[PDB]
Structure 1
Amino acid sequence: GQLVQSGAELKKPGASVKISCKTSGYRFNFYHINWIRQTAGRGPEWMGWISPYSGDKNLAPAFQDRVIMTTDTEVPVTSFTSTGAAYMEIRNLKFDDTGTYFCAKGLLRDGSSTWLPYLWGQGTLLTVSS
């Protein structure tokens, strides 16, 4: 199970940015995709998750007005393996949005903690400058 993210990008204030998250080695529809942000002045913060199966989303109020999540239709490899990708777009970037962005695979089906991240991508940097 592996996740791969779009590389670092420099943006002007007010610009939107889209970050891809390609996945492989596990069934894409079986687990939630969690977007997590880290900023030096805030520490790690949850940005919300999207189910690849239903398209259902759960975002923090902090990001509900700025962040849009979508996923690709999965393409099967084996009966228990598939590939696909998640995307997130952040609208109206602020300097406070600078930091490291991570894509992570959900832990399990039908548990009490289904959406919690288990496998993480390396993460990539977002920078904002005049």
Structure 2
Amino acid sequence: QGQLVQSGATTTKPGSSVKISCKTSGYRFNFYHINWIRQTAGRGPEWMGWISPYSGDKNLAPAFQDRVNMTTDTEVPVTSFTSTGAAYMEIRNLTSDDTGTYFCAKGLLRDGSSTWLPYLWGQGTLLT
């Protein structure tokens, strides 16, 4: 299974800094990365970066190197294999050119060559 409910689709104006939430269920939140993907209207879809709900190790594209704060809090065990978690997304020197739909997607596998690959996506959120 797996679900990743995202935050609201509210809008602000340039210069600000917004927070996007992603709430997970039905899967062990710590066993897969959490990716942030952006589908702007005036650019091809961009991979922003992934983060580890277990190791805390984050990795973003150099286009977002010093402009994004990715944070996740610890999970809440529901069963032996089910937990609930959350992931957060931020932008610093923000303008109105960063407009589009934002998604959160968890990793594919736990090991191998396609560990972090965005496999399970959220419903997306509309921006400014």
Q: Which has the higher strand share?
A: 1
Moved over 3 A (4+): none
- Please state how far the C-alpha of 1:75 moved relative to its aligned partner: 0.3
Deviations for 1:5-50, whole angstroms, at most 9, x for unmatched residues? 1111211211001000000000000000000001111121000000
**Whole-Å Cα distance in 2 between the matches of residues 9 and 91 of structure 1?**
17
Deviation at 1:119, TM superposition (A): 0.7
Q: Give deviations 1:78-113, integer Å, cap 9, x for gaps.
A: 111100100011112111110000000110111201
Q: Which runs of 5+ in 1 are unaligned?
A: none
Alignment RMSD (CA, Å) = 0.7
SS at match of 2:119: strand
Task: Tell me how far apart the structure 2 counterparts of residues 105 and 49 of structure 1 sit (CA, whole Å).
Answer: 8
* Identity, % of aligned positions: 94
Contiguous gaps of at least 5 residues in structure 2: none
8 Å Cα contact 2:19-2:90 kept in structure 1:
yes
Q: For 1:1-130, what aligned pairs fall within 5 Å after superposition?
A: 1-127=2-128
**Separation of aligned partners in 2, 1:31 and 1:76:** 15
Q: How far apart, CA to CA, are the structure 2 residues paired with 1:81 and 1:7?
A: 25
Measured in 2, the distance between the counterparts of 1:2 and 1:64 equals 28
Q: Distance in 2 between matches of 1:13 and 1:90?
A: 11
Aligned residues: 127
User: TM-score scaled by structure 1?
Assistant: 0.95
- Give the SS at the match of 1:96: coil
SS in structure 2 of the partner of residue 15 of structure 1:
coil
2:34–2:52: 8 Å Cα contact kept in structure 1? yes
